[PDB]
Amino acid sequence: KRVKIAKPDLSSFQPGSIIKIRLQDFVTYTLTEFNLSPSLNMIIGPNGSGKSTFVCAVCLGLAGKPEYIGRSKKVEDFIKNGQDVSKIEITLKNSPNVTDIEYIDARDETIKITRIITRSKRRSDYLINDYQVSESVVKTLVAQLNIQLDNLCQFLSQERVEEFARLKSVKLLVETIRSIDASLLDVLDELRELQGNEQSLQKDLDQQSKDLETIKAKLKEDHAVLEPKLDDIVSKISARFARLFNNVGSAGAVRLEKPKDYAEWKIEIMVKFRDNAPLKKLDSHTQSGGERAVSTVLYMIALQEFTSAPFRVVDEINQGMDSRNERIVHKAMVENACAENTSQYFLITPKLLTGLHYHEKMRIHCVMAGSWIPNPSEDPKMIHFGETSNYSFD
């Protein structure tokens, strides 16, 4: 019978994932379709061939702007040279937990978000299930899906990779305290400053005697409330760090050192991937680039299940790190993809690596074109790039 493409049933796919992506009127790709695996995604292709352009278009489709991803803004690059409008369509699973939606019911399972870029018009106009809206609606939807673009944890770019490369313990403390509500740290800092000034008044005294007891009682109560939650969080993240570093054959844990002063609490990362390198904080100059990249990627992965973001985006990651650290981080990615209901990562491989391991759960996508291959628009079966389940029935 007639060949039928696999049904893009969003119920089977995990919530927040993307099944089919439509790319219209872009550089060297005017008519393209992409299918993304529910577990994890792999795209193979040289940098500058449109794969990075396609990923950036997907990012901009969901209330994304070029200057909000930590990179230069080039709207004209997306628009096909000659064509007036360039269009990206992205479909996600829908759940009755997000408000301010147009035309789509809560019980509905489909959210279609379309972004169009044109030269003549300079405005932020998006589409929700093919209905024109301002960027505010799509932005608040993205906020209500627990996914963030400005934050570097959910989305990783080349500038963000560089920023993670030289990362201080204070930044680790900041990101830990921003993941959970940051009011607790502010309150404890206020109480510790109150303790300091009360102790200063006490040595000055050496009305004042009535103080330093209620203050210390309040400080003890706040510390007692604060301690178990961060203790269990630190234990969990350290366990995840160890279970992600086991494949490297190294021992490491994310420890939260807590001096007497609450603001002096810092984050320590234990490194064992290289025997010569002693146990110290992550830094680019002393350690090798590949091992540091693997460590920070694993640290990103550890803070994914706890987060409610539907997926995480990493860019310029599969580019070779010594062909050994990159191999072990690919093995870690395979192991993570073995677990079900995991976030979908849009992988970028600017440089080809010999003997890459391909898990059955993940699928590779190729965007390269051949001279003997007919034009994608004229060939009905060539519109899909790097997809094999489309040809087979269902």
Partner 1 sequence: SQFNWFRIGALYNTISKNAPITDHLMGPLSIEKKPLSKKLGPEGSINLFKFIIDPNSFSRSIENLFYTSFLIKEGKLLMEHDEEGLPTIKIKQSISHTDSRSKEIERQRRRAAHQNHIIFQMDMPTWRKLIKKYNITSPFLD
Cα–Cα distance, 371 to 362 (Å, whole number)? 28
Cβ–Cβ < 8 Å for 83, 114: no
Quick one: 85 or 184, whose CB is closer to partner 1? 85
Quick one: 138 or 328, whose CB is closer to partner 1? 138
- The annotated binding site is made up of 45-52
Angle between the 214-245 and 289-302 helix axes, to the nearest 10 degrees?
120
Q: Hey, is 255 helix, strand or coil? A: strand
Minimum Å distance from CB 61 to partner 1?
11
Quick one: 80 or 112, whose CB is closer to partner 1? 112
Phi, psi torsion values for 124, nearest 5 degrees:
-100, 95
Cα–Cα distance, 41 to 361 (Å, whole number)? 9
Cα–Cα distance, 307 to 84 (Å, whole number)? 39
Site residues for partner 1 per CB under 8 A? 85, 87, 89, 102-105, 112, 114, 116, 127, 130-134, 137
Quick one: 105 or 232, whose CB is closer to partner 1? 105
Cα–Cα distance, 309 to 312 (Å, whole number)? 7
Minimum Å distance from CB 3 to partner 1?
21
Minimum Å distance from CB 393 to partner 1?
24
Minimum Å distance from CB 88 to partner 1?
9
Cα–Cα distance, 163 to 98 (Å, whole number)? 32
Cβ–Cβ < 8 Å for 347, 337: no
Minimum Å distance from CB 119 to partner 1?
15
Quick one: 118 or 169, whose CB is closer to partner 1? 118
Cα–Cα distance, 124 to 211 (Å, whole number)? 57
Quick one: 97 or 341, whose CB is closer to partner 1? 97
Cβ–Cβ < 8 Å for 2, 391: no
Cα–Cα distance, 103 to 317 (Å, whole number)? 38
Cα–Cα distance, 244 to 301 (Å, whole number)? 8
- The annotated binding site for ATP is made up of 45-52
Q: Give the list of residues 6+ apart from residue 291 with CB closer than 8 angstroms, or none.
A: 271, 273, 274, 277, 321, 325
Minimum Å distance from CB 149 to partner 1?
21
Cα–Cα distance, 282 to 295 (Å, whole number)? 9
Cα–Cα distance, 55 to 59 (Å, whole number)? 6
> Is beta strand 363-366 parallel, antiparallel or unpaired with respect to 41-44?
parallel
Quick one: 129 or 148, whose CB is closer to partner 1? 129
Quick one: 68 or 131, whose CB is closer to partner 1? 131
Q: Which residues of 17-39 are buried (b: 16+ CB within 10 A; e: fewer)?
A: bbbbbbbbbbbebbebbbbbbbb
Quick one: 128 or 303, whose CB is closer to partner 1? 128
Q: Give the list of residues 6+ apart from residue 229 with CB closer than 8 angstroms, or none.
A: 180
